Design a protein around this nucleic acid. Sequence first.
RNA 1: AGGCCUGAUUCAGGCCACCAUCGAAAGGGAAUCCGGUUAAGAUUCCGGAACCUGGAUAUGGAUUCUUCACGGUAACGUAA
Lengths: 12, 26, 97, 77, 112, 135, 28
Amino acid sequence: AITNLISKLKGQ
Amino acid sequence: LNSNPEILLRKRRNADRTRIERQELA
Amino acid sequence: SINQKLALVIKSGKYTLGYKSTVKSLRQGKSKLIIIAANTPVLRKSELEYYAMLSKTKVYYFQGGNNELGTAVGKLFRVGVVSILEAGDSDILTTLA
Amino acid sequence: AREITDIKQFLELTRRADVKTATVKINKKLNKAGKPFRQTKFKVRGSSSLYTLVINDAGKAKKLIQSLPPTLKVNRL
Amino acid sequence: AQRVTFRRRNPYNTRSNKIKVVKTPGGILRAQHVKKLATRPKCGDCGSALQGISTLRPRQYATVSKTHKTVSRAYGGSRCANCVKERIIRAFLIEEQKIVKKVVKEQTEAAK
Amino acid sequence: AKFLKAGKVAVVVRGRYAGKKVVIVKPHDEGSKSHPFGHALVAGIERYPLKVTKKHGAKKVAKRTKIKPFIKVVNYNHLLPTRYTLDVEAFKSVVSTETFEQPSQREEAKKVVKKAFEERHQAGKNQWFFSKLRF
Amino acid sequence: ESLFNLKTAEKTGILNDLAKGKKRMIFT
RNA sequence: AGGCCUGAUUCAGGCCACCAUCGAAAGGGAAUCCGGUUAAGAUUCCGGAACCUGGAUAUGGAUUCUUCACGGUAACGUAA
Ligand SMILES: [Zn+2]
């Protein structure tokens, strides 16, 4: 089960 | 090789298809 | 930062630098995350994206060229794409980065 | 011109209908061992080329000479 | 130390008539005109010389078999291997992107 | 996860069959003694079937729908995997490592693959697999 | 003519279906 | 401003665009060499040897179950 593959920094 | 001369008539091309188209046209 | 996590991964974890190694690890299913430089050619980038979609591997678009990504990794040569086989001591995988 | 290695090919060439003559050429020459020997070239021309068969063995050349058709004109040298 | 000259009508040192000097079976030096060298066929996408294709003059290709001027792969004899590989990959990815864009359009027009 | 498994459709990018569509029957990730690289046994289409319209009839339709198959050992580097799948249950037993060392087994495998492909095409299934890629 | 993009691949919101080979289309 | 194609016989339909010609014995261009020979001719003649182009056709082989062939991961190879 996948919904998103592009990742981003959480602290910004 | 013991042959015999003769004249051969080749089969006409697209005969059945043309017959069908003529039948539908009429 | 993201450079610190990458440096820690190279120091302690397991990685593959380059397109061929990244694709091989994607085929073998051993990749946890692929970092793509912004300087990579469009055809190779699209092929990597399709392979990641097939293998369900997370994608992170690095904000810099292949030389900036190479310097971030800690190597004096350009790297166009990095694949993280094992995070090791770092926490790049945990923070969704 | 062409060079052939097959003896029966040469005989087949000499057996064709439109053949004029065949040339037998003798050459005295040295081998790599330094011992001189006698080399025979059988030359016959087909339709548009001249086929040459080179034989370095005296006995094989003699057998080929004996195997030529009796109605074929042979040019010695 | 014998001097030789042209054997044809052209008396000028043009590219068309070029002379080589050869020693004939008569023991003398004589001139011989050399033809223009053939050029290797080039790829239609990158311009690199095609591999596996014989190099001949334009009219000499009409007398050789098809295996001496083609390659068994698709586009063989016109494009090289790498260009064909790029063409295949690009076509497949373009088709996939078209499918994805069509699905996105269907979804975004399905709201109303 | 791994996507180069049995039943996965791939596009060959290198070799005589470049641009042709194949289906993977048996993946070998560690390779073999004769093929020391990550390779796969595939069954693909060498001559795609031609389209049939209402004008065609009887023998012509039988001629146009014939499919020529091929069986190959392909390196992973020479394959482009797709997201599509095709069932290989009919002929997963004829295409093996042994098949490519015995020409008679190659002949039998190609016969079986041809029959299976023609049956599946006539069933109307897998229209994408039996369509040529335009490149 | 644009190549495959993962951003527009996620904009549809269905990645499991696409990776499973769900939407198959033949053009031209 | 013209050519071509389709058609069980119905003259109907269809495709395509663009301008004559002249202008180079140094440009582009299919293919011949050696030896000999005359008072005076030679890559032209003679002897031998070989190529290019076009044409009609026959034979062998291939086109492997009956219908447009195979091999190698690949670059690529092949008598078709
Ligand atoms: Zn190329």
